[PDB]
CSV table of C-alpha atoms in Angstrom, one decimal:
chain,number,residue,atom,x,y,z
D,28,UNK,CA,75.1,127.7,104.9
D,29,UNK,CA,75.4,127.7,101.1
D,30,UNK,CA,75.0,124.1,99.2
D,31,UNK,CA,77.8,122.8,97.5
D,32,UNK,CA,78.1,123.0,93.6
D,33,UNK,CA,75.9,121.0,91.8
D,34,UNK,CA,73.1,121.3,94.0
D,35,UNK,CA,69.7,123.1,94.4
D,36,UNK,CA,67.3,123.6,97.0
D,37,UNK,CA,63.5,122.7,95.8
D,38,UNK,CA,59.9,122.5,98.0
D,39,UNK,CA,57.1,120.1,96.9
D,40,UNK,CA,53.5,120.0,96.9
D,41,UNK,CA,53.8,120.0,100.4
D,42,UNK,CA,55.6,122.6,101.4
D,43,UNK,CA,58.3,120.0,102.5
D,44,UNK,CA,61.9,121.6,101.6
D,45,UNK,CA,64.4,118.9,99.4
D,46,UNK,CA,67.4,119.1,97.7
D,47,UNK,CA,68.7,117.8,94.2
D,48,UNK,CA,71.6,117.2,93.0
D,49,UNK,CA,72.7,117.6,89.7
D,50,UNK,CA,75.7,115.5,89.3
D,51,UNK,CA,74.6,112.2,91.1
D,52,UNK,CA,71.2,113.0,89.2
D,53,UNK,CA,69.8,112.3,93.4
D,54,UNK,CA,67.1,114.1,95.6
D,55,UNK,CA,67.0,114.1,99.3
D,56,UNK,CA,65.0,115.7,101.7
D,57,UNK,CA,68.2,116.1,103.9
D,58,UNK,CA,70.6,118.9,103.2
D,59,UNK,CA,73.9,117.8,102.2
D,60,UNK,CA,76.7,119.0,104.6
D,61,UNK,CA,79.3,121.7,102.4
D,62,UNK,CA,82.2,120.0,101.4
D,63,UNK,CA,85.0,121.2,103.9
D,64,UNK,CA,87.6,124.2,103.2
D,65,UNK,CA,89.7,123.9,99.6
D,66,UNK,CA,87.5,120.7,98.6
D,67,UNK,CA,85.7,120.2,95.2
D,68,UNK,CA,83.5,117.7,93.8
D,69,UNK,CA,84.7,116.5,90.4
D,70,UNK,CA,83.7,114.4,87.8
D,71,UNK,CA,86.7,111.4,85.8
D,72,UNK,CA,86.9,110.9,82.3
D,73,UNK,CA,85.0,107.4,82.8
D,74,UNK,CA,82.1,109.9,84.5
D,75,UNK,CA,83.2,108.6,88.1
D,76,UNK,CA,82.9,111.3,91.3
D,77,UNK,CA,85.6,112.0,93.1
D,78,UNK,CA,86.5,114.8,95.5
D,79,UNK,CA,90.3,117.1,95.1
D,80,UNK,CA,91.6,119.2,97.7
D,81,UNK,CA,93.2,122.3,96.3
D,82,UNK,CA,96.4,123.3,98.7
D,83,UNK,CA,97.2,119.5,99.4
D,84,UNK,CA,96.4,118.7,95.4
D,85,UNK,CA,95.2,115.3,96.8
D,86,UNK,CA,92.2,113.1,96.2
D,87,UNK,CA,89.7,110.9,97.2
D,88,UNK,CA,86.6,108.6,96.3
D,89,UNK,CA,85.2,109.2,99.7
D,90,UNK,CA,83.3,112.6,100.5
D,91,UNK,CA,85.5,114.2,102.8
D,92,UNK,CA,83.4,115.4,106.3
D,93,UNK,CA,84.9,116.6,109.6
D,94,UNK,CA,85.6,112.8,110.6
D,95,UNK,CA,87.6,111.8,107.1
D,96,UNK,CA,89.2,114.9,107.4
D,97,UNK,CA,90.2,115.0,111.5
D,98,UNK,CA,91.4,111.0,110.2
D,99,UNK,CA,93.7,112.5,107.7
D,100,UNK,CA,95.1,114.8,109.7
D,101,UNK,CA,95.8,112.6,112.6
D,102,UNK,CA,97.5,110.7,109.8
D,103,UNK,CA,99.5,113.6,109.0
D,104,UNK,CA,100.9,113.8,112.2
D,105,UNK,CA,101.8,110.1,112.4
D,106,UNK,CA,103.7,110.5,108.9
D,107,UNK,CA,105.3,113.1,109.7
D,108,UNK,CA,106.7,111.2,113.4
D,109,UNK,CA,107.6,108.0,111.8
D,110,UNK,CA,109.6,110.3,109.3
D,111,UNK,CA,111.4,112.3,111.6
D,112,UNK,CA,111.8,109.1,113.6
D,113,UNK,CA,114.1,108.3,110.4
D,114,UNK,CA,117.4,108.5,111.8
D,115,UNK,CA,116.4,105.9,114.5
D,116,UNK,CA,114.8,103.8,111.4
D,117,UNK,CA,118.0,103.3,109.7
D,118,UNK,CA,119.1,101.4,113.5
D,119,UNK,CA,117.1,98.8,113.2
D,120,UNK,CA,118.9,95.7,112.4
D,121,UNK,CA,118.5,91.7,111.9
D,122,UNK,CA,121.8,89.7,111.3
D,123,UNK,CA,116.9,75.1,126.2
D,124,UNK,CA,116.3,77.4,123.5
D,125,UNK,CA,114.5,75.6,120.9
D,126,UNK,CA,113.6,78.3,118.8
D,127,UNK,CA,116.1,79.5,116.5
D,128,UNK,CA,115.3,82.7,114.6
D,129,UNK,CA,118.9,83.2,113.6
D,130,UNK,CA,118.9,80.4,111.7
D,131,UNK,CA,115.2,80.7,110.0
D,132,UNK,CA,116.2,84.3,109.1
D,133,UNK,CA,119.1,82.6,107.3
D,134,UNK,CA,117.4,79.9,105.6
D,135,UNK,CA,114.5,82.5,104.4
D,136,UNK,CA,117.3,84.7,103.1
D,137,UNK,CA,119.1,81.7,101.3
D,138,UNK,CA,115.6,80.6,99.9
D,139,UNK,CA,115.1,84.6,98.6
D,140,UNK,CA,119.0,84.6,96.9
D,141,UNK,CA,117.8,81.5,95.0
D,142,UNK,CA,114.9,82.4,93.8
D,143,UNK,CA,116.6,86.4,93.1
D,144,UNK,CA,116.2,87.3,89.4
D,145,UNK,CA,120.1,88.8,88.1
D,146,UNK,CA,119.4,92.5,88.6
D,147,UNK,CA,117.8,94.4,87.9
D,148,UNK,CA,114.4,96.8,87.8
D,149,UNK,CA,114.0,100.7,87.6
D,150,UNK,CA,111.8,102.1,90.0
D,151,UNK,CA,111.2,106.0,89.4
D,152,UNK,CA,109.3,107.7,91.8
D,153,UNK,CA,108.9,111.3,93.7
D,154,UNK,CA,108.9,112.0,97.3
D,155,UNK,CA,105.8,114.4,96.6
D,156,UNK,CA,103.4,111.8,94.8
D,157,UNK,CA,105.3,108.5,96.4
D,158,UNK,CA,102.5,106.8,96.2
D,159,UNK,CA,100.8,106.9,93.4
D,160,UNK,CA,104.0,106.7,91.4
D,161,UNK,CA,104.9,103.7,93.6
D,162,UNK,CA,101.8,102.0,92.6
D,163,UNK,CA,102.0,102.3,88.6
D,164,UNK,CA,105.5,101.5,88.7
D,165,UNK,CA,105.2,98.4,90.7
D,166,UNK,CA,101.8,97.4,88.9
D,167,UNK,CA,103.9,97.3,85.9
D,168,UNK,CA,106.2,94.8,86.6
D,169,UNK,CA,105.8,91.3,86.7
D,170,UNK,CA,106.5,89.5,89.8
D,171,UNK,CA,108.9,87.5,88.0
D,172,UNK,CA,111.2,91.0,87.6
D,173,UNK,CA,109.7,92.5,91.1
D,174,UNK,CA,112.1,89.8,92.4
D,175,UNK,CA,115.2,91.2,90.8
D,176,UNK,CA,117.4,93.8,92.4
D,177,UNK,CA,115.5,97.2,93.0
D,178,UNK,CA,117.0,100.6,91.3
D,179,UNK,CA,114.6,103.2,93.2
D,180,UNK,CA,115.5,106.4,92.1
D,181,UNK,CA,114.3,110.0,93.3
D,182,UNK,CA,114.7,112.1,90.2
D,183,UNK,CA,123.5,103.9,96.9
D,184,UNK,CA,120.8,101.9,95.1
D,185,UNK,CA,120.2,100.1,99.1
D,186,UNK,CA,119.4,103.1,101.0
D,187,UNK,CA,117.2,104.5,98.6
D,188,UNK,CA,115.7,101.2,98.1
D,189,UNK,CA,115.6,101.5,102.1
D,190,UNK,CA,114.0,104.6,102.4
D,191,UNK,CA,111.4,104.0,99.6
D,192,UNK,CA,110.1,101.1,101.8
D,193,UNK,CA,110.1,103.6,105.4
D,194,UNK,CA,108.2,106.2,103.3
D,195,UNK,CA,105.6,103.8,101.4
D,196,UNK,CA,105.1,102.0,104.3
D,197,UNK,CA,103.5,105.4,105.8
D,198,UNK,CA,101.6,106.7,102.6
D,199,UNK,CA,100.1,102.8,102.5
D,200,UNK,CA,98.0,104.1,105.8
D,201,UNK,CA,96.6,107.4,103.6
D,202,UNK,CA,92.7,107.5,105.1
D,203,UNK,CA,92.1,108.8,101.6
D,204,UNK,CA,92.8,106.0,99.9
D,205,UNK,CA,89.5,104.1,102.0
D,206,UNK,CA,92.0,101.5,102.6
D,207,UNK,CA,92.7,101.0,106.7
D,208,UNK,CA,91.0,102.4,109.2
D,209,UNK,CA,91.3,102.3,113.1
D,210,UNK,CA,89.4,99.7,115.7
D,211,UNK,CA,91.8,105.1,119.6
D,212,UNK,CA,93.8,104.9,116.3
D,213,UNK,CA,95.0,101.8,118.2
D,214,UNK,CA,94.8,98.7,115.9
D,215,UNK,CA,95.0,98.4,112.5
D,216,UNK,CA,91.9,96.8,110.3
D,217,UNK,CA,90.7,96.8,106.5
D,218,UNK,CA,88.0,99.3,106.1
D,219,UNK,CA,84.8,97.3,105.0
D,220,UNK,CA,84.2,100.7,103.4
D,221,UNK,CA,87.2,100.4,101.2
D,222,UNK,CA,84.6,99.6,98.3
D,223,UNK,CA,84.1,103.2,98.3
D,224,UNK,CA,87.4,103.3,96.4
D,225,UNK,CA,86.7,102.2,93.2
D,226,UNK,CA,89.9,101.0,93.1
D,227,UNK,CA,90.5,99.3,96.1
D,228,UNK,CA,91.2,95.5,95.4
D,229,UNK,CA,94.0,96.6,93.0
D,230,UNK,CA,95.1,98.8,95.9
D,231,UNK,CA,95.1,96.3,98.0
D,232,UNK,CA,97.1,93.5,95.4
D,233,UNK,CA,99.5,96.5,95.0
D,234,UNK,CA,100.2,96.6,99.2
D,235,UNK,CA,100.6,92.6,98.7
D,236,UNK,CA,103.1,92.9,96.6
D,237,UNK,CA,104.8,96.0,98.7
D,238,UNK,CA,104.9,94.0,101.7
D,239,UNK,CA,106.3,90.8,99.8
D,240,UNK,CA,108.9,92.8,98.4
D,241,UNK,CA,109.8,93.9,101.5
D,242,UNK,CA,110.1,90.8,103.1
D,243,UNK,CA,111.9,89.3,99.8
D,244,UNK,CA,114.7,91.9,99.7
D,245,UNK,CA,115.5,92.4,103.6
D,246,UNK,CA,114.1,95.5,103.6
D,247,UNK,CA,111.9,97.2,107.1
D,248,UNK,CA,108.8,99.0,106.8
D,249,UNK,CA,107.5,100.9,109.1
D,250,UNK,CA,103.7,100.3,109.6
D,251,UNK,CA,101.8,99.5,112.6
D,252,UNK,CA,100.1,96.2,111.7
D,253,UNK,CA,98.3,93.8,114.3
D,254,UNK,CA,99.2,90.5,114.9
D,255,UNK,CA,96.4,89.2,113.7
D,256,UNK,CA,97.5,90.8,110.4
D,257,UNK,CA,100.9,88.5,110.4
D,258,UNK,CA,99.1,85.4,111.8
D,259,UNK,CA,96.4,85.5,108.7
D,260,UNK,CA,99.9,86.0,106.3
D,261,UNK,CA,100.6,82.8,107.9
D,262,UNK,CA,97.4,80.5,107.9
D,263,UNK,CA,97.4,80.7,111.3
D,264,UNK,CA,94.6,80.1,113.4
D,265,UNK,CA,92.6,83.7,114.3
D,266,UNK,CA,90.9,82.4,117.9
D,267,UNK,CA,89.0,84.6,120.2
D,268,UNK,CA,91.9,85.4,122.3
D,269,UNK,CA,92.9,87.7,119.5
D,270,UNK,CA,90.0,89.8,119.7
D,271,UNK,CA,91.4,91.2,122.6
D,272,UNK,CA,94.4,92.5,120.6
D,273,UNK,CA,91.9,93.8,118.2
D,274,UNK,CA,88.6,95.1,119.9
D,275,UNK,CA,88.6,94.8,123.9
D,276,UNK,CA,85.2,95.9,124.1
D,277,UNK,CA,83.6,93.7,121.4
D,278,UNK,CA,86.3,90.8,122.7
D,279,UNK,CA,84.5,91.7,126.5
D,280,UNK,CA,80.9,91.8,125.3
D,281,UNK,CA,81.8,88.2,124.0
D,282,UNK,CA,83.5,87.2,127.1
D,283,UNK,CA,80.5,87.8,129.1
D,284,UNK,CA,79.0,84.3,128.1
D,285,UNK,CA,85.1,84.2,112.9
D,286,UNK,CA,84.2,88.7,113.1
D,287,UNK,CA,87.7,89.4,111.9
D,288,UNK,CA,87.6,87.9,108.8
D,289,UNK,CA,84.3,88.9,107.9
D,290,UNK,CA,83.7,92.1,106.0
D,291,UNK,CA,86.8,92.5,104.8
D,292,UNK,CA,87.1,89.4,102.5
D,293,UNK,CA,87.3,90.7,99.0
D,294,UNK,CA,90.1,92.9,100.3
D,295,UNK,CA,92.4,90.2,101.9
D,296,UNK,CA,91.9,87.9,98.7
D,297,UNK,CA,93.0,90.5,96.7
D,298,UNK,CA,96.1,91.5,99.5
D,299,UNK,CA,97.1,88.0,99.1
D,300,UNK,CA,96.8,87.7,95.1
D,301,UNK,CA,99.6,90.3,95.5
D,302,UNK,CA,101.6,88.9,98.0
D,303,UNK,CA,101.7,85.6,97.0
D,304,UNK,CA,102.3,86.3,93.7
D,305,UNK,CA,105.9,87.5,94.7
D,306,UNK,CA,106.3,85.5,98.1
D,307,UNK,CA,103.8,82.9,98.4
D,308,UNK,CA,102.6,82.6,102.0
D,309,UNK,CA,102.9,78.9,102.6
D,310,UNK,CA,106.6,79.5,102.1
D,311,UNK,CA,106.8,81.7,105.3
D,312,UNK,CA,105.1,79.1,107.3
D,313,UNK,CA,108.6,78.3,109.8
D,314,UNK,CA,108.1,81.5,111.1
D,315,UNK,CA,105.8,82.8,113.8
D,316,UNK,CA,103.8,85.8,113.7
D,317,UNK,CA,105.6,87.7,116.1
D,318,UNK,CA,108.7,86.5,114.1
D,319,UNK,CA,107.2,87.4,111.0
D,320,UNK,CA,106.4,91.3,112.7
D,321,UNK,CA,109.9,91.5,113.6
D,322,UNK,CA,111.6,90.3,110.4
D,323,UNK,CA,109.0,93.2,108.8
D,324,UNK,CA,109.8,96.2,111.2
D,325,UNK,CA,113.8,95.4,112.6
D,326,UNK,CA,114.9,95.2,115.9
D,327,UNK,CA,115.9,97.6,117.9
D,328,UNK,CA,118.0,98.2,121.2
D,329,UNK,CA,115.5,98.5,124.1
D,330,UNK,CA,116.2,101.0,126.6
D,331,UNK,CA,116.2,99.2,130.0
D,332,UNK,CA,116.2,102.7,132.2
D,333,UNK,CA,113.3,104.1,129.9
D,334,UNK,CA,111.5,100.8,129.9
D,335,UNK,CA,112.1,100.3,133.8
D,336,UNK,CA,111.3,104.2,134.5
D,337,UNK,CA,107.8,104.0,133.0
D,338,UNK,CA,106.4,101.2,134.4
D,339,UNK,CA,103.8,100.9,136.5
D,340,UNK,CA,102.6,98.1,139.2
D,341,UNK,CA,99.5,94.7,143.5
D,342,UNK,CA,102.8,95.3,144.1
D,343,UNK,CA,106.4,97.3,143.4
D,344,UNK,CA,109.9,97.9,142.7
D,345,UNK,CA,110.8,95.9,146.1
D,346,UNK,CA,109.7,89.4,142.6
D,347,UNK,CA,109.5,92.3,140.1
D,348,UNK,CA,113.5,93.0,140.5
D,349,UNK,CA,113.7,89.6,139.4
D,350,UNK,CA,111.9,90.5,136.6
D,351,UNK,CA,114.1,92.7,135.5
D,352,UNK,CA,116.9,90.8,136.3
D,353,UNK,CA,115.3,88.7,133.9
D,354,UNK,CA,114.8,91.6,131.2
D,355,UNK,CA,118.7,92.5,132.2
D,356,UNK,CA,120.0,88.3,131.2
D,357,UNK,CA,118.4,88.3,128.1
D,358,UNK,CA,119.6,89.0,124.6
D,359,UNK,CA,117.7,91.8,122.3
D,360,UNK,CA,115.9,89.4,120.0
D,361,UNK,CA,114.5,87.7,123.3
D,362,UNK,CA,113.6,91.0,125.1
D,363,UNK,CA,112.1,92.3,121.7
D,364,UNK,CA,109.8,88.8,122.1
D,365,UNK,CA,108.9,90.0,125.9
D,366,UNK,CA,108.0,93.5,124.4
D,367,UNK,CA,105.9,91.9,121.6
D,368,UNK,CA,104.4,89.4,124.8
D,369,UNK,CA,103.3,92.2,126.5
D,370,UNK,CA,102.6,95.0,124.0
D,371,UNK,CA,101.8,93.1,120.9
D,372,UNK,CA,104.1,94.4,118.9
D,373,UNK,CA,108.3,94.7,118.6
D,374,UNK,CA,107.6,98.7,117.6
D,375,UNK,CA,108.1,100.7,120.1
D,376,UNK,CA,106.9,104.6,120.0
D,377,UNK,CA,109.8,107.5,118.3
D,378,UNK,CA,109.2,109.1,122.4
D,379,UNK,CA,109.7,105.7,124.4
D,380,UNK,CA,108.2,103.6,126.9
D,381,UNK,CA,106.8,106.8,128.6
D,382,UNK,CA,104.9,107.6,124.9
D,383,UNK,CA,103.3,103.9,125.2
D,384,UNK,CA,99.6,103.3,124.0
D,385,UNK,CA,96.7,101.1,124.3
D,386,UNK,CA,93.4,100.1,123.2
D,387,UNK,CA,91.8,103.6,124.4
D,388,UNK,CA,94.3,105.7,125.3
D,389,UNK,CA,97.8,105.8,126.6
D,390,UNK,CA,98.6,102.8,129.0
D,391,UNK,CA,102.0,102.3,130.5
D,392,UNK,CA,103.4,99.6,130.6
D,393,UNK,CA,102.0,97.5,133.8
D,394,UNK,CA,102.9,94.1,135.8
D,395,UNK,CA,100.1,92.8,138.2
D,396,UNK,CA,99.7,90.2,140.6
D,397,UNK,CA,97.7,86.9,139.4
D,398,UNK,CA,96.9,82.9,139.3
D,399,UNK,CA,99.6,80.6,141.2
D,400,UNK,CA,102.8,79.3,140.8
D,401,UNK,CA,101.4,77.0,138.8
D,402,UNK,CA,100.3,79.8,135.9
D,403,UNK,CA,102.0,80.6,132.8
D,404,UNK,CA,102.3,84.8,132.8
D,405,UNK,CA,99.4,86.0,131.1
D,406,UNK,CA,99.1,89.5,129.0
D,407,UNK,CA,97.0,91.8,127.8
D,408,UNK,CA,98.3,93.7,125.1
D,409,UNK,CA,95.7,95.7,124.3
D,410,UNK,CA,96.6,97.6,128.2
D,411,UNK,CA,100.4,96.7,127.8
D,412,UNK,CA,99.6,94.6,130.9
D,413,UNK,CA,101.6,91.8,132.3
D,414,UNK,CA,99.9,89.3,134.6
D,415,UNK,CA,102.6,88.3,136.6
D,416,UNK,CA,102.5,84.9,138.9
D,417,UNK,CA,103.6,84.8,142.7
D,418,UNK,CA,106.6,82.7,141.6
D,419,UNK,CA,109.0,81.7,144.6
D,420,UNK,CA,112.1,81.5,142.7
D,421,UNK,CA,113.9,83.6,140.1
D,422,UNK,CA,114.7,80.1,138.2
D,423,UNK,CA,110.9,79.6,138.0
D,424,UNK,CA,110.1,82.8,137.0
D,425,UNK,CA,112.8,83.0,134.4
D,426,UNK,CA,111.6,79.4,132.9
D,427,UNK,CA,107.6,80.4,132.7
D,428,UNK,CA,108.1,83.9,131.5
D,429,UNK,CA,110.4,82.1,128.9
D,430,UNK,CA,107.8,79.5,128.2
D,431,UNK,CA,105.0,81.7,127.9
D,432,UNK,CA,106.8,84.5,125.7
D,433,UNK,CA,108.6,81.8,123.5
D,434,UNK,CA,104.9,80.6,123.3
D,435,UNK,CA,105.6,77.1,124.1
D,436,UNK,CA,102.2,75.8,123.7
């Protein structure tokens, strides 16, 4: 198997076989693995190395093996889903119960109008390099003029604006950018590794800003973030109960007897210089993170015979009915909360509730006998699972599962 370019293959004093390599100016005594089908090793004008794949025309800073690569792919096909899932994208909509997220959704958007700039920026990208375009042209702006009305334009100003946000929202997740990676392809984390990008903390001010302007112009994306994700946008408390929504197996290991902050430091800071420079944080702070997901990604209708047809159960359909008598009563914003309760999120999969995923694999969704009457429901979202009380009356059922998915206390 051939060495890549830039390489040669030398033996020592000692017989012992080793390699050099030209352009990092490196030796090893380990021979390098060939770069992967259409890849080449290049050198910047500022003497940097970076790698170009020659039928996709795209690069990278990390040296692309058959993990990176399998990584991009699998991100290929999610792009490519979410995209298709477009016509189902443009749906989604927005507008004792003590919490009102009508009326925060109105104040938030009275608080945007008056701090809205009169209109309005230019922003000129292509579908092909969406991206990178996106990322000079917003860098370029002040946040000041991020904050007037947006003029996308693909060589209505609202549903190009619209679908700017869908399809930036998926390039954001580009393994070859070193930016996200995967706790499964289940959660979504900052790579540590993101430092192999050069570039990454602008990256990282430029998705700030991104998801800012999102949330400052109405706009959806379409990204699977955790909740953790929404809760740190909020200064919310990270506790250990949410490393079961990130990592079930590190989250057991510690349930046998501050790992989601560390490591990736550097790259929130630098998230959050761009975010707060167009929406500062603290002003988000009457929402909740679930409210703050849902605000992000729209609501949706919820298919009751999908949802109901792929569920799965210590006991069955014959105190479950009243569940979904439950599901049934309640509006969409509160069954979106129940879905977000259970699952972790208010996204549900382009296939349905038959398509559902967990922490390491598919998991359907799942309702199972536990605690007394006494309980709040628990969850574990991580399995789509629903730990469901012996409750004796549908009253008391309907008031806990309220409590517990309103997240009373």
């Amino acid at each position: 198997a051939p060495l890549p370019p830039g390489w040669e293959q030398r033996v020592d004093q000692h017989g012992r076989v080793y390699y050099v390599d030209h352009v990092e100016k490196r030796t090893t005594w380990d021979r390098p693995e060939p770069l992967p089908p259409g890849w080449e090793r290049r050198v910047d004008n500022m003497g940097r190395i970076y790698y170009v794949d020659h039928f996709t025309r795209t690069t990278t800073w990390q040296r692309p093996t058959l993990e990176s690569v399998r990584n991009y792919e699998q991100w290929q096909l999610q792009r490519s889903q979410l995209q298709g899932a477009m016509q189902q994208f443009n749906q989604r909509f927005i507008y004792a119960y003590v919490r009102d997220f009508k009326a925060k959704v109105q104040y938030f958007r009275f608080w945007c109008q008056q701090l809205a700039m009169p209109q309005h920026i230019k922003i000129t990208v292509t579908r092909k390099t969406l991206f990178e375009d996106s990322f000079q042209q917003i860098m370029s702006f002040s946040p000041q003029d991020l904050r007037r009305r947006l003029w996308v334009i693909f060589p209505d100003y609202g549903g190009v604006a619209r679908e700017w946000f869908f399809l930036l929202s998926h390039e954001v997740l580009n393994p070859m950018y070193c930016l996200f990676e995967y706790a499964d392809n289940y959660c979504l984390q900052i790579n540590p590794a993101s430092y192999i990008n050069p570039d990454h903390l602008k990256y990282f001010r430029f998705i700030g800003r991104f998801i800012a302007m999102a949330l400052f112009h109405g706009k959806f994306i379409d990204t699977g973030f955790s909740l953790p994700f929404y809760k740190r946008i909020l200064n919310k408390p990270v506790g250990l109960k949410d490393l079961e929504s990130i990592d079930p197996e590190f989250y057991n290991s510690l349930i046998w007897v501050w790992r989601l902050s560390r490591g990736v430091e550097e790259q929130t800071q630098a998230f959050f210089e761009g975010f707060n420079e167009i929406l500062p944080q603290q002003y988000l702070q009457y929402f909740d993170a679930k409210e703050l997901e849902v605000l992000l990604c729209g609501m949706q209708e919820i298919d009751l015979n999908d949802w109901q047809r792929h569920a799965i159960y210590h006991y069955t359909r014959t105190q479950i009915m009243w569940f979904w008598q439950f599901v049934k009563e309640i509006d969409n914003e509160k069954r979106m909360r129940l879905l977000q309760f259970v699952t972790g999120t208010c996204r549900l999969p382009v296939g349905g509730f038959a398509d559902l995923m967990g922490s390491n694999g598919p998991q359907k969704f799942c309702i199972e006998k536990v605690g007394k009457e006494n309980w709040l429901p628990r969850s574990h979202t991580c399995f789509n699972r629903l730990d469901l009380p012996p409750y004796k009356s549908y009253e008391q059922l309907k008031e806990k599962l309220l409590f517990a998915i309103e997240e009373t206390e």
